[PDB]
Amino acid sequence: MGHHHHHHSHMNSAEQTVTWLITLGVLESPKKTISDPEGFLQASLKDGVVLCRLLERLLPGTIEKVYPEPRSESECLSNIREFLRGCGASLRLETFDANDLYQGQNFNKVLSSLVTLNKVTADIGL
């Protein structure tokens, strides 16, 4: 096995995001190795709550109201909508549709939004 330590693999767009959510204290630490990083993200972010904490750890006081326990469909969509609220208004970055995350349609857009959220906050120099 010829490991060439000059050219090593790099953590993918999803891997950095998972770790990013954990260090910000908005997502819990996994009990195992994450086989599906993007899938794990979608299932965890589906209810919006994690994204609400995410935005409140970067822009503290942007989420007007979050449902820590969303019973109704519109409640989950509202939590995601609050995330889109701040990221679309204050930051004005790559936004997506609540249906993409909640119904697991186009996660590629959701991940792009998360990565961009890291890009803009890095640009601030946090």
Query: In the CATH hierarchy, which fold is given to the domain comprising 1-126?
Result: Actin-binding Protein, T-fimbrin; domain 1 (1.10.418)
Best CA proximity match to 47, nearest among 23, 68, 31: 68
Cα–chain-centroid distance for residue 29? 15
Helices vs strands, H then E, count in the chain? 6, 0
CA angle 91, 13, 46 (to 5 degrees): 70
Q: Where are the domains of the chain?
A: 1-126
Burial class (CB in 10 A: 0-12, 13-18, 19+), 110: buried
Element (H, E) at 60: none
Q: Which residues touch 3 (CB under 8 Å, ≥6 apart)?
A: none
Burial class (CB in 10 A: 0-12, 13-18, 19+), 59: middle
What is the token pair recorded at 7?
Answer: 């050219």
What is the token pair recorded at 111?
Answer: 């991940």
Burial class (CB in 10 A: 0-12, 13-18, 19+), 121: middle
